[model samples]
Target: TADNKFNKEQQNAFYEILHLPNLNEEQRNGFIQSLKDDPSQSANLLAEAKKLNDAQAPKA
Candidate 1:
């Protein structure tokens, strides 16, 4: 079961997609909020990703 679930590669891929420059800001916020609403599995993943994004695009 664990093996079939998201692994390091999967997580990295998801992370990359989340921070993609072409994605709409509104859509991205909606997706992140959805995760925050029930992030039991992802835990602090949303925040961690935001941190990475902020570091990359501080003005954005």
Candidate 2:
């Protein structure tokens, strides 16, 4: 919906992080529930998820 705070790229990034092996079920579900409870916070949540994903990335 237009009210969603996250754009397509942010949404993709969020879901990508969600499927990563690094995050446990509790972490993933907690993030999802938070978003569900406050959709307007999606941008902040997406940014946080991207940071988590970056931290999980292997250093070259």
User: Quick one: best lDDT, which candidate?
Assistant: 2
In model 1, which regions exceed 4 Å deviation? 1-11, 40-60
Across 1-60, the per-residue lDDT of candidate 1 in tens digits comes to 354344544355455647667455565666455554544444345445555555556463
Per-residue C-alpha lDDT of model 2 across residues 1-60, encoded as one tens digit per residue: 565446756666666766777666575666666766766666666666666755666767
Candidate that would win on TM-score: 2
User: lDDT of model 1 at residue 58?
Assistant: 41
lDDT for position 27 in model 1: 53
C-alpha positional error of residue 52 in candidate 2 after TM-score superposition, expressed in Å: 2.3
> What TM-score goes with each of the models?
0.34, 0.58
C-alpha lDDT of all candidate models, in order:
0.52, 0.65
